[PDB]
Ligand SMILES: O=C(O)c1ccc(Br)cc1O
Ligand SMILES: O=C(O)c1ccc(Br)cc1O
Ligand SMILES: O=C(O)c1ccc(Br)cc1O
Ligand SMILES: O=C(O)c1ccc(Br)cc1O
């Protein structure tokens with residue numbers, strides 16, 4: 001059980017709950033951005049998903065990068081021709097934080113198709129570190145999910161993989177997801193994955209841990225349920241393609257439930 | 263943050279780390295003595311080193327009396343200055359200075375208790391230190407000891423994922439790392455502190471190996487070669503070999519002869535083979551060994 005740190009998992013959970021509020025982006029940031037939109041952010045995140053697949057980055061890395069991007073964009077006005085520079089520097093910082101083997105800077109320049117120079121990437125890296133004041137150890141959807149997964153009776157790979165796909169889907173669409181905390185999207189995704197695969201519900205045990213009920217998760221669940229139904233038609237498709245892979249049990253091929261009874 | 267290099271007066275070099283040199287400096291307005299750690303980014307072609315990204319981001323969130331305090335990070339276009347609180351000495355130098363005196367037991371007990379407080383705080387904040395050794399533990403004139411050098415630290419998730427193999431300075435490295443296990447956890451930091459405990463008592467390293475295999479063999483010869491009974495799964499581990507010599511476990515009374523019953527009990531629980539049975543820093547705080555713990559100033 002030491003891999004699941006029995007003596008610390010509650011302290012850690014409590015701490016992440018505090019930190020997620022501190023690391024939260026401004027829910028309405030995109031209205032104050034003159035030149036970029038939810039739609040361009042969707043394109044960027046979808047690209048970052050592909051980059052993560054291309055370089056075999058952790059999912060956690062992708063989630064960190066998105067956190068860094070939304071917090072920067074919460075205080076820094078950005079022209080559309082620089083959105084991708086912010087994104088690349090965000091992915092670089094996330095990789096150095098989270099990866100055993102981050103890709104070299106040159107590789108990050110390469111994936112931008114020489115839109116930007118090595119000097120621009122590195123200059124943006126510093127800028128992002130300055131705006132975030134090095135607050136990089138942000139709670140993600142994934143960090144909550146992996147704890148919630150411990151409450152399965154018994155563990156189910158399809159439930160796990162489907163929850164990760166659903167949480168990843170939420171990264172794409174700042175409206176509505178910017179309004180929910182990582183721990184709440186994770187709860188919605190976990191309940192929705194569990195319901196889809198086994199027909200079961202958000203367990204008592206996770207009510208004990210999180211304080212969240214199906215009642216409190218309802219709004220987010222209704223959003224996530226709609227995102228799931230509409231996912232085949234969404235303009236951005238990289239996550240569905242990714243979660244076709246056997247690494248993730250092909251869960252993007254599972255049918256969403258038509259109704260939740262919630 | 264709220265800083266500038268013109269308000270600092272360099273005093274002397276105190277060290278050299280992963281980024282270059284640490285200086286003792288003095289804040290000329292407040293009087294505060296600090297350690298500056300210069301991170302040259304001009305000599306960096308991959309921009310800010312990941313070591314620094316982890317050290318800074320992690321230390322920002324670790325506010326605790328037994329963790330060294332990062333006061334500020336001064337950002338220049340070519341240079342990064344990490345401003346830490348100043349501590350006078352590391353535990354290694356103190357042990358060498360205590361050569362033929364010994365460290366009095368009240369001070370060993372105080373130091374171990376504080377180290378456990380510091381480490382428990384790390385683990386409660388999803389942080390693994392991954393390089394606990396006496397050179398990285400700083401002491402002041404008031405009796406405090408603090409975890410330092412977070413250059414190899416990492417933020418973990420629950421459950422842990424696979425992280426960097428071959429962390430921890432060799433003499434302080436846990437058996438599960440030496441055996442190439444897919445996963446390691448907070449238990450690796452306890453193993454290090456256990457070695458440090460023994461070392462504070464004897465003034466010499468408990469397992470001074472010259473190689474990964476020699477390190478493991480030294481451990482085995484002291485604690486006995488682990489089998490499935492003491493440590494389920496050990497015989498399956500990637501770098502476990504059935505040809506490994508099978509040494510009998512020696513009585514812990516002979517591992518650190520000067521240690522009392524309580525001390526031995528605690529040491530044994532820190533150095534348990536099985537990471538799952540090894541004591542946590544949180545639980546160790548309650549061990550009877552600390553019943554009479556105080557916080558005396560160092561004796562030198
Ligand atoms: O012009 C766009 O719509 C656009 C979208 C996403 C990114 Br990243 C950059 C762009 O320029
Ligand atoms: O111009 C575009 O539409 C565009 C699309 C995706 C990315 Br990433 C950057 C872009 O600039
Ligand atoms: O980047 C910053 O401004 C900063 C300020 C203070 C501390 Br402590 C760490 C930092 O990284
Ligand atoms: O005063 C300076 O300019 C200075 C430069 C480098 C270091 Br490390 C400490 C300092 O105080």
Ligand SMILES: O=C(O)c1ccc(Br)cc1O
Nearest residue numbers: 297330346348349410411
């Ligand atoms: O590495 C550190 O955190 C550190 C802090 C303070 C002193 Br004095 C030396 C150090 O090495």
Ligand SMILES: O=C(O)c1ccc(Br)cc1O
Nearest residue numbers: 473474475476503505506
């Ligand atoms: O790697 C080595 O050098 C080595 C030497 C001896 C034995 Br037994 C196992 C080893 O792995």
